[PDB]
Amino acid sequence: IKGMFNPKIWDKTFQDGLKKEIEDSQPYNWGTIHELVNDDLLRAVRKEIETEIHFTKKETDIYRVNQSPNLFKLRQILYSKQYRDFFGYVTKAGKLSGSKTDMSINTYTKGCHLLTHDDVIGSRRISFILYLPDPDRKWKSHYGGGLRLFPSILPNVPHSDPSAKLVPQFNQIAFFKVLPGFSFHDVEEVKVDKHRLSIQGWYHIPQVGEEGYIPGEEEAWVRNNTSNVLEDFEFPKDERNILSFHEVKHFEKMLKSEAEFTYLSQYISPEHLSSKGIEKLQKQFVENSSLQIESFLNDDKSELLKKVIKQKELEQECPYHSKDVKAPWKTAIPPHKARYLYIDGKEYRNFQTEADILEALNNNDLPNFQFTKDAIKIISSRENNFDAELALIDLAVFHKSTIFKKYLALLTSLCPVSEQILIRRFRPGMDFTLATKCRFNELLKSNPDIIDAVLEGTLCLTPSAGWESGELGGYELYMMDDGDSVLINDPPAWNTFNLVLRDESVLEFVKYVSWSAKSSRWDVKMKWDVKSC
Amino acid sequence: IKGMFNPKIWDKTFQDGLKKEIEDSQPYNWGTIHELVNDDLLRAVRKEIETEIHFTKKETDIYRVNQSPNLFKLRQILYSKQYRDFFGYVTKAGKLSGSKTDMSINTYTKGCHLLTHDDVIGSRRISFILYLPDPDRKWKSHYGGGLRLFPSILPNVPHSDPSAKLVPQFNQIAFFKVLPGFSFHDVEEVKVDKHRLSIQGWYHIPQVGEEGYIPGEEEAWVRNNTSNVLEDFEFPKDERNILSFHEVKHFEKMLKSEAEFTYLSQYISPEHLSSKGIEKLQKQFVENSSLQIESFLNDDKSELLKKVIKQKELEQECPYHSKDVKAPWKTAIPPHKARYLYIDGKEYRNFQTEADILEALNNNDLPNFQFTKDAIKIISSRENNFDAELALIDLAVFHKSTIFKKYLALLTSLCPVSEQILIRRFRPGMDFTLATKCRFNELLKSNPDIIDAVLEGTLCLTPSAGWESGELGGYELYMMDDGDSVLINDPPAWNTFNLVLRDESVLEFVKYVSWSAKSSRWDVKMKWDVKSC
Ligand SMILES: [Fe+2]
Ligand SMILES: [Fe+2]
């Protein structure tokens, strides 16, 4: 007497064709029904929400999305046994509690986005989401908002690029047995000004005294989810190369030059080489444990970079699939921890297969921006593709100079003992990172002299405008954990230098750059391990 | 009444021309008189030695040389005031004790050699050496044995190549005010079968109650000589790059593969990949803390290398001046600590001037044999110059593979946490190293897990014959200090692999390769820091 869905969902020859679609489905097992419910019932339950429900915008590292009568009816007929049975059949999940229900209504409006994840929380068995776009008009693909599925190139290593994506329509449902490590999906940012209404939900383990219930099963699942060995599949790695004994020795000695100050002055702005610049820079750090230099690079370099970068954004075509990223550039992986372009001093890697990865793990090389610089320059119009790189690689060498670190030690009265340097490019479509702590060196933590902190520096070279604030994304965020505690929320800017000294409690990330960004965010990141001087 | 020298040495217009030669002399202040003594007196004092004195061969890292009536007369007339006065005048040393005398007779016979040093021990003021070759025949330049002076490119940083060299004759004397840090000289190996007799000596500070004596002066000199900051001018450096967290993590895990064993088998010989090979290799190390694998590399590689190397020795022309060393090769400096060719993963450096050095210190890059490999291969007959390199660089990458270190960890039940790899070439004319200990990491020694030892490995790929024993040099020596204790004295061989685990007490060096060697000694050296597993 609840057969008020699409009559066909009850026709067994449709049901059977459906279990065999889900079976053949790629990259993991998922399915979609095109007009799930009685058209009249949706229009009603949409109309209702539209006039009764308040949706407020929320933003974290992983998403931006606006959250929160006969809607009740829809909730009953979905957790109805007539439907649960059918669902757990075509989907091959077996039994699923109609007692423990959970749904959520959300609108995705322009700029709203959920990026990659596997939906695997606690007790969820099957995940589904019915869509509620405008019934009267067709939802075009280019509007965005599509649901995207990720091929896994290793259990718990989703490929950076999605391989499936459906443009959902009004009465459409998408769902999938939640298979841990594989069911990676996200929702493509909404690139147009509209409000895509949606009802997400989840069926769960059958509960105590419920049809299909097995004792201890529920916990044999969630307690199962606890390992970190996946660390090895993070590129780039969060580990710092140690400094030559002479670099560190030299620094200590200083804290117990006419040629040095001229070296420094050919990259950094006179304002910060001056005694009173340095003096102020010293004052600020001592108190804030950070410093936020404006117009850091001197004009000659600031000009050149801006020129080659603004020129690469315009005359050039940014690769948007990982397979398309060409040397010197690598793409950061996996997509459920981050996704951005970058050049480190290392040998070229394009991870498409498990073997590509394993290769790089066995043949692990050390960073060398000089060799890299040489190699690019030997090649040589697409060459503007390298104009920006050469410019930026020169910039990399400079911050790898023992003189620069001397300058750095001076500002901070801290001695650099290690170094990592990465020049990164976040593209409006795709790039971002998520809130994470820093990875102190395991070899060093067994040592007093090196304090439990990482000196993190970021030199933004983002040329374009409108990064305020910060509905365009790309902003860098630091903050504590355990109500908000954001310590820095710096939108992308041109020619700024940020220095934080992070302990464990501080989490950082640069927010997904929105598709509507006028350019990619460029910057040079640099971490150092640090001793007391 | 001792005017039985060359009458002219007493003529003041010769004396004055002499102080102005020593003044203009390069690279530091030194002089030579062509027929110092009464010809009859030398012939007598030579004849005497020839028939009364026993000379026995002695050998250390720095030299090979045979050591040990009217000779007494020569000793009196040299420490005579008539002469001391004149000497300390033309030389500008002031007063010099005729009380505290010291001389030494030595013959240099074929293969005998003293390499670079500054003669600066204790109280010596001026250093001299009168020669006693065959009076009747002329000592030709190509016989070798010449005295050679080194330009200093920094106080206590002698240039690798000598800039002066005189072929001494019978009645010739060479001498120089001993100026610490600059007076670097050596004697070119004697390349011919003859016995060059010589009387070395030294004038000292004036002593207590002696003409020209100042109290506390003597000790204000020797106690002056005590600093280590010169470490920074050693290339290559004796410091190890740390391993990625995954490499070490992986090793621990193993000590708490069908694809690995096929990887290993494409460089190393089946004999040592077999379970019983491995088993024996394990037994040996556990007891000897070392192992000396014979025919290590498999035949296909052993053959290829031998081919390209034997081919580079023949068809090619080895650079013999540092300025001539071309990429990929660097020369090790300074010459009073070592001198040999080598390729490390690093960017090309040719140190001729103080600025060349400083450049490299400021722009310190990390090793990368892959980039290096690429760069060589892009270039391309002189190209055999690279045939051997490509062959050897491939060999380098293999020992930098996380798989190989896994294999290494297995033999030793030790975990590699760091790595340095150098492929080196010792040339018959010039190359060698001296007895030194290992340089434990200063950052790590503050840590229990890493034991106080370095795992040192050497893969000799010396093709030629006659390295026995070991009058040709090039042998690798380990030993303790504080009577002989040599722990290993392995002449150069083809395709051997040596593994020692050195603590502090063990000193190593590869002996000066003699000019008469049939080829250069080639090898791949590799050091690792090590944790307990
Ligand atoms: Fe989801
Ligand atoms: Fe000497």
Swiss-Prot record, chains A, B:
Specify whether Phosphoprotein is a keyword of the entry. Answer: yes
Misc note: Present with 8910 molecules/cell in log phase SD medium.
Query: What is the required cofactor set for this protein?
Result: Fe(2+); L-ascorbate
Designated name of the protein: Prolyl 3,4-dihydroxylase TPA1
Q: Does the keyword ATP-binding feature in the UniProt annotation?
A: no
Q: How does it assemble?
A: Monomer and homodimer. Interacts with FRK1, eRF1 (SUP1), eRF3 (SUP35) and polyadenylate-binding protein PAB1. Interacts with ETT1.
- From the UniProt record, list the coiled-coil ranges: none
Q: Which UniProt keywords apply?
A: Dioxygenase, Iron, Metal-binding, Nucleus, Oxidoreductase, Phosphoprotein, Vitamin C
Name of encoding gene: TPA1
GO biological process annotation, one example: regulation of translational termination
Judging by the UniProt lineage, the source's domain of life is Eukaryota
Ranges of residues in domain Fe2OG dioxygenase: 99-205
Q: Please tell me where Fe cation binds in this chain.
A: 117, 119, 185
The species is Saccharomyces cerevisiae (strain ATCC 204508 / S288c) (Baker's yeast)
What do the Gene Ontology cellular component annotations say?
Answer: cytoplasm; nucleus
Could you say which residues bind 2-oxoglutarate here?
Answer: 131, 196
Q: List the cysteine pairs that form cystine.
A: none
Query: Which EC class is this protein assigned?
Result: oxidoreductase
Q: Which residues are recorded with the post-translational modification Phosphoserine?
A: 505
Query: InterPro entries, per this entry?
Result: Oxoglu/Fe-dep_dioxygenase_dom (IPR005123), Oxoglutarate/Fe-dep_Oase_C (IPR019601), Pro_4_hyd_alph (IPR006620), TPA1/Ofd1_C (IPR043044), TPA1/OFD1_N (IPR039558), uS12_prolyl_hydroxylase (IPR051842)
The task this protein performs is described as:
Prolyl 3,4-dihydroxylase that catalyzes 3,4-dihydroxylation of 'Pro-64' of small ribosomal subunit uS12 (RPS23A and RPS23B), thereby regulating protein translation termination efficiency. Part of a messenger ribonucleoprotein (mRNP) complex at the 3'-UTR of mRNAs. It associates specifically with components of the translation termination complex and is involved in both translation termination and in regulation of normal mRNA decay through translation termination-coupled poly(A) shortening.
* Family to which the UniProt record says this protein belongs: Belongs to the TPA1 family.
Q: What happens when the gene is disrupted?
A: Decrease of translation termination efficacy and an increase in mRNAs half-lives and longer mRNA poly(A) tails.
The GO terms describing molecular function are: ferrous iron binding; L-ascorbic acid binding; peptidyl-proline dioxygenase activity; poly(A) binding
Q: What is its EC number?
A: 1.14.11.-
Q: What does it catalyze?
A: [ribosomal protein uS12]-L-proline + 2-oxoglutarate + O2 = [ribosomal protein uS12]-(3S)-3-hydroxy-L-proline + succinate + CO2; [ribosomal protein uS12]-(3S)-3-hydroxy-L-proline + 2-oxoglutarate + O2 = [ribosomal protein uS12]-(3S)-3,4-dihydroxy-L-proline + succinate + CO2
Subcellular localization, as worded in the UniProt entry: Nucleus
